[PDB]
Every structure is written in structure tokens, then in C-alpha cells.
Structure 1
Amino acid sequence: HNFVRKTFFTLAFCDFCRKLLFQGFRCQTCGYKFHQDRSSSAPNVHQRIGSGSFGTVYKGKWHGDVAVKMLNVTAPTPQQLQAFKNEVGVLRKTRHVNILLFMGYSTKPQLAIVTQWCEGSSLYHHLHIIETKFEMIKLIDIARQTAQGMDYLHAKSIIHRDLKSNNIFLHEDLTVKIGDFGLATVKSGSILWMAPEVIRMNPYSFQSDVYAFGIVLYELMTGQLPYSNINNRDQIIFMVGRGYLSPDLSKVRSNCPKAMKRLMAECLKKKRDERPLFPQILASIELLARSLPKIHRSASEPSLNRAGF
């Protein structure tokens, strides 16, 4: 790393400690900046589908294009029914631009969810059915709008429990929104997004959603599920936990910004405490979103470590 002193004229965070940084450094090759006291100010602000994740999914219909999915193995006991009614008693209240509207609960026993599906594919389709070729700035945008959705879920302490690329939906490039949120009552499909810490067996940590989001960024940057040729989940699943295996950061496309590779790398941190929280991720993605217009198509001769320690 090489460094320059920099004033940050915009909301930005100190990568060592994730606190706000007004004044300090930038790694001129990496953006990372050392944590080098003052109080903070106020910043500037400006038909069947399948068993599903853990509920069998149907293209149901009622007024408002509401699809349906049904309980799997968890029995509709009154304790769990009450917990579901309480979780619904959050989700049916929250509405957010990057979240699909939770519309209500099916009144019959063997509970089922009524929630809107917006036309345009699951993100799973654009990745693995096609790998639809589109501008990299829209890859950042997808990451932004998904992240900004997850930011509200975390801003509401909704933990996704089992976030997957399949449960993310694109309005034909108009926007992306999050499904499969909350509803932890039914949990305990397929699994590459489980954090290593969880597969070492509160696994639905506030920060476990971070790791799953990390896997989504890999798929965006690489066009594929992780572990391209070690595909036996049941073989890799334990050992991605036990410390052997993590997704190959080299498979990213050569024209991605170094910082996005870096963001993914910090996102995939195994030790939970400092997997970055989503406000910082959002700020990082917000920096990339305008950095990509700024950065030149090819590198040049920097100022040679001019103001490092």
C-alpha cells in the first residue's frame, strides 16, 4: 500500500474501525485508510415453483399479483403460529423501495404467505440461466439497491436468516427488490450462502446476512456460483466451514475496480465481529458508483508514496 493525505468531502468510513472519517488518509492503490482525537460533527446528507428456501413456492394469484408460498416441515403450533403472527406483525408494517411488499398471511392452517411478485426475472436467472451481458455500472447499481434494501432490513433489525441470490428480483433493470425476508419461524433447499461460522454449527446473525450478500457480489463479478469446479455442496459445505475453502477472488473480471474485489474480500471475513456493517458497505458502494466514472481506462504513474509515514 501507498498513501496520500486526504480530506473526505463526503460521507466515508475508516476501514480499520468502520467509524466516520472526515480527515486522514487514502491508500492511493487501495482506498484503505489507516485509523489515524476529535468529536464528530453532523455530516452532509443528500402453479408450483419448488420447495423454495424453506417454504414451498407457488405462482399464486390474487388482486395485486401476489404469489404464494407454503410452510414446509415446521408444524403450525400455536407458539410458532404466534411467532409468525409477530414476525408478520413486523413485515406487514414495513414497506421499502428495495423490499417486496408483504401483503398479508393466509388465514388457513398450514400458513402461507401472500406477497407481490414483480415481473422481470429472479437475479438467479440473469446470472445462471443467461449471464445477461450488461454494463458494469449496472452491476454496481444492482449491488447498491440490494444493499440499500438490506440496509433498511438491518435498519429494522429484520435478519434474513437465509438470504440467497434466487430471492432477489429485478424489475427489468428498472430496479431490484428483496424477497424471502424474515419469517424465521419456518426455518429448520440448497446452500452455498451459509456463512462458514454457521456451517461450523445465533446463526442468523445480523452479520450473517453480510456474508450471504458477499456471495451475491461474487456471482455478479464472476457470473457463476462459487467453487466453479468443486460443485459437490455436501463435500465442500463442511470444509468451507472448517477453514479450507473460500471463493476464488481471481475469477473476477479483469476490468472490475480493485476496490470492489477489496470490498468482497472484507465482506467475506470469517471472524464475525468485523464483517463490515451495511451502512459502511453502502458508503463503499456509493464511492464505487461515482469512482467508476472517475477512474481512467488504464493506469498511470502515481505520486510516489509521497505522503506516507
Structure 2
Amino acid sequence: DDWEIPDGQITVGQRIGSGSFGTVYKGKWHGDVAVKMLNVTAPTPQQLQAFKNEVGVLRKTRHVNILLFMGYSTKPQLAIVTQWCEGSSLYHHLHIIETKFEMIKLIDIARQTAQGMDYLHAKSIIHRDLKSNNIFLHEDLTVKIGDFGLATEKGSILWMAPEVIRMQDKNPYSFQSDVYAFGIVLYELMTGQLPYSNINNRDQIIFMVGRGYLSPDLSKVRSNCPKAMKRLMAECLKKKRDERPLFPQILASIELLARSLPK
């Protein structure tokens, strides 16, 4: 009862993207599927250890808001097959084609991003890289979370929590760490913009956010953004680690201050 797919099965289709550590190929296997090819020339030792994780950690998840894992493949290049998702990433929606989401929808995109994340931590899985770019809106409804990146190892700083920018310890990452990100994703949803937008200089934003001199200008949340939300938003972006809430509490908040809206 394992999940290795014998080679010569997954009909590697066309290309989707490719970078530093990977290539995604929209393929075929009992249905449309995304196949992430890792190696090429040959498989590397450090590399191989990576694969054994993005998998062991994927197969441990099984929830409707997290990118489904179909199986892996040692054969012709290490390969991870995950359901193909039609549509585009949150980041694309908000900052590229600038779609205008009705408010209710926004609150729910968050709601789901919350459930997903709340599940990932239950299984004791720290994402280490949540961001609007990893929030995929499947079929334009239903948030699918995954690490759709390819220039990492396991970068992008806007969703990076202060402690992480500083790196004081060895393991800056933690459940809290992830929330801060969710905090920025939330801030995104409600203002429809990225943070530090006026500062045109990567090095600086990195430094100020690290020293506590910089923080998202919460005075941009939409006119109608629930006061109950903006509250929580700030509750997460808290610069102090242990002052941010876990997700069981986050989810409940959003959900509550949700049933009181459609009218």
C-alpha cells in the first residue's frame, strides 16, 4: 500500500515552470496532474535527501485545502505527482490581473487559508513559506495550499516575520512564524496591495522589518473591512513572537465574524 508510480505511466505533458531546484510539467496519469521533476543530469546526494521530505511531509497531509498528493516517482528523475489545479495563484489574482473580489469572498478565501493552515499545524507541519503565491484558488473557488516555489531548498521577504529576518537561534521558524505570514496574506486580502509598497529598496525593508521600525500600514484595509478583522490582522502581525495566536483560535475568530455578514 505504497505510493510509488512505476515509470512509463505518467505521460509527461508540456512545461509549466522551472527554476533553481525544479520543473513543473502539466502531465497525465488517470487524469490531469502536475508533475514536479527535481533532478536532471543525475540525482545528487543533498538533492535526494530533499525529495524524501517534500514527499514524506506531503503524504502526511490529507485535507481539502491542501494540494493533493497523488504519488511520487524514483524512475526517470525523482518526481512528485500532485493533482493538477486549473486557475491561478492568489498573488496572481490580486496583483497581476487585479480581479475585484466581492468582500464576502475575500473573507472566505481567508477562512479557507485558515482551515488549511490550521490542519497543517495539527499534523505538526510548519510551512516555512506561506504567501499569496502559494495560495492557489482552484477553479476560482477553494483555496489549495502548497509550496508552488522552485528557487528554494526547504527568496521572498514581505511575508517574513521579524524573528526570521534576524535569525537569532538556529530554528527561527515556528507555528507563530507562519501566522505572521497569514497576517500579511490577510493584510493583502483587505487592502488588495502588498506591504511596504512605497519603499523601493529591498535591503531596507529587510532591515526595518527586522528591527521593528517597519510594519504594514493597517490604515489601508477597505472601507468595509470588518472591524473584527482588522483587529485580528494586527493580532497576527504582532512583532513579538509569543504574542501572536495559534491557528485554532484564528480559524474560530474568522468563522464567527463571518456568519454575521451575507445580509
Q: Distance in 1 between matches of 2:140 and 2:204?
A: 36
Deviates more, 1:201-210 or 1:157-166: 201-210
Deviation at 1:70, TM superposition (A): 4.4
Identical residues among aligned pairs (%): 99
The verdict on how the C-alpha distance between 1:185 and 1:237 changes in structure 2, with shifts beyond 3 A counting, is closer
- In the TM superposition, residue 254 of structure 1 has moved relative to its aligned partner by 1.1
Contact 1:140 1:288 in 2 (8 A): no
1:190 — aligned with what?
156
Deviation at 1:198, TM superposition (A): 0.2
- The CA deviation at 1:237 is 1.3
How far apart, CA to CA, are the structure 2 residues paired with 1:158 and 1:53? 24
Q: 1:183 to 1:166 in 2, by over 3 A?
A: closer
Task: Give the Å deviation of 1:52.
Answer: 6.2
Counterpart among 37, 60, 65 of residue 93 in structure 1: 60
Contact 1:68 1:112 in 2 (8 A): yes
The 1:52–1:184 alpha-carbon spacing in structure 2 relative to 1, beyond 3 Å, is closer
Structure 1 residue 84 corresponds to structure 2 residue 51: yes
1:278 is displaced (CA, Å) by 0.5
Distance 2:229 2:12 in 1: 24
* Distance apart, 1:293 and its partner CA: 4.3
Report the Cα distance in structure 1 between the residues aligned to 2:159 and 2:24, rounded to whole angstroms.
19
8 Å CA contact 1:267, 1:276 repeated in 2: yes
Do the aligned residues in 2 keep the contact of 1:53 with 1:190 (CA within 8 Å)? no
Q: 1:61 to 1:215 in 2, by over 3 A?
A: farther
TM-score normalised by length of structure 2: 0.81
Over 3 Å counting, the alpha-carbon distance change for 1:111 and 1:230 in structure 2 is farther
Question: Aligned pair count?
Answer: 250
Answer yes or no: is the 8 Å Cα contact 1:83–1:185 preserved in 2.
Answer: no
Change beyond 3 A, Cα 1:183–1:150: farther
- In 2, distance between residues paired with 1:45 and 1:129? 29
* Residue 116 (structure 1) aligned with residue 73 (structure 2): no
Pairing 1:227–2:193 present: no
Q: 1:74 to 1:80 in 2, by over 3 A?
A: farther
**2:166–2:210 Cα contact (<8 Å) kept:** yes
Once the two structures are superposed, what CA deviation does each residue of 1:238-265 show, in whole Å capped at 9, x if it has no partner? 2211111111101111111111111100
Query: 1: CA distance between counterparts of 2:202 and 2:17?
Result: 19
Residue 6 of structure 1 corresponds to none
Change beyond 3 A, Cα 1:122–1:185: closer
User: Alpha-carbon deviation of 1:199?
Assistant: 0.2
Partners in 1 of 2:197 and 2:251 — Cα distance? 28
Structure whose CA Rg is larger: 1
CA RMSD of aligned residues (A): 5.8
The secondary structure found in structure 1 opposite 2:75 is: coil
Contact 2:60–2:123 (8 Å) recurs in 1: no
1:98-117 deviation digits (Å, cap 9, x = unpaired): 11111223315864432123
Measure, in 2, the Cα distance between the counterparts of 1:46 and 1:217: 35
Deviation at 1:269, TM superposition (A): 0.9
Check the 8 A contact 1:98/1:146 in 2, yes or no.
yes
Shift of 1:121: 1.3
Q: Distance in 1 between matches of 2:255 and 2:166?
A: 33
Tell me how far apart the structure 2 counterparts of residues 179 and 160 of structure 1 sit (CA, whole Å).
9
Cα distance between partner residues in 2 of 1:221 and 1:46:
37
Cα deviation for residue 229 of structure 1 reads 1.3
- Sort the Cα spacing of 1:128 and 1:86 in 2 relative to 1 into closer, same or farther, 3 A: closer
CA contact (8 A) 2:21 2:151 kept: no
Check 1:181–1:127 CA distance in 2 against 1; reply closer, same or farther (3 A cut).
closer
TM-score, length-scaled by structure 1:
0.70
CA deviations 1:59-103 (Å, max 9, x no partner) are 444443222334499996557635642552342242101111112
Residues 119-149 of structure 1: CA deviation (Å, up to 9, x unaligned): 1211112101122112211111111111001
The CA deviation at 1:271 is 1.2
- Is the 8 Å Cα contact of residues 12 and 35 (structure 2) preserved in structure 1? no
Q: Note the alpha carbon deviations across 1:260-303, whole angstroms, 9 max, x for none.
A: 11110011011111211111000110111123347xxxxxxxxx
CA distance in 2, matches of 1:142, 1:53: 30
